Amino acid sequence: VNSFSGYLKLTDNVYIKNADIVEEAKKVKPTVVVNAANVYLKHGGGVAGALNKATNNAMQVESDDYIATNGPLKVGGSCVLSGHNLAKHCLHVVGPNVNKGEDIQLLKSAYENFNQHEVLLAPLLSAGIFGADPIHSLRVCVDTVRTNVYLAVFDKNLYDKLVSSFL
Numbered sequence: 144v145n146s147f148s149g150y151l152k153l154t155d156n157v158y159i160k161n162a163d164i165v166e167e168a169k170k171v172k173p174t175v176v177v178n179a180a181n182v183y184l185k186h187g188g189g190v191a192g193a194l195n196k197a198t199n200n201a202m203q204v205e206s207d208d209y210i211a212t213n214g215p216l217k218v219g220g221s222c223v224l225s226g227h228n229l230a231k232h233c234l235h236v237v238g239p240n241v242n243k244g245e246d247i248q249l250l251k252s253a254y255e256n257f258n259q260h261e262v263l264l265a266p267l268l269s270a271g272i273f274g275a276d277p278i279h280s281l282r283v284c285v286d287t288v289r290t291n292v293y294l295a296v297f298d299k300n301l302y303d304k305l306v307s308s309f310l
């Protein structure tokens with residue numbers, strides 16, 4: 144049993160809600176919140192900008208030290224950093240950005256990072272401003288993640304479209 148409320152059950156392990164991931168994190172304080180990061184951990188907009196703003200820029204400060212020490216992530220890769228005031232940990236996951244010309248086949252690899260954590264609050268990777276088909280991303284999520292994932296979809300029209308088209 145956990146604290147996530149009002150999520151629609153899609154499969155044995157995947158649940159979905161039309162919600163702002165920042166507000167969900169502030170309410171539940173999950174062990175892991177997933178950020179839709181880029182390889183440089185530059186948290187400018189989207190999920191990343193919103194999470195970072197909610198941490199008063201502490202996420203960015205921590206991320207800059209991470210990159211200075213370790214260099215950029217891989218597309219499809221991840222790192223575990225602090226969740227600051229929002230969660231115990233933040234799993235920064237890099238899905239491919241189609242608007243940058245990156246390979247959508249890497250989306251499965253990106254979702255595989257979720258399997259290292261028993262429960263996660265997460266966004267829909269590579270969708271929205273990352274340019275990929277959101278129906279496809281949800282399919283890859285359900286067909287790749289085996290641990291318990293609570294998906295928070297910001298856009299209301301998108302949420303309705305995803306639910307109504309889900310197989």
Ligand SMILES: C[C@@H](C(=O)O)[C@H](NC(=O)c1ncnc2[nH]ccc12)c1ccccc1
Pocket residue numbers: 163164165179188189190193266267268269270271272273295296297298301
């Ligand atoms: C799909 C899309 C959505 O769920 O609509 C999602 N975006 C957000 O979650 C979002 N965007 C901008 N400002 C925000 N503030 C609070 C949340 C939030 C998203 C997922 C992966 C990559 C980029 C974007």
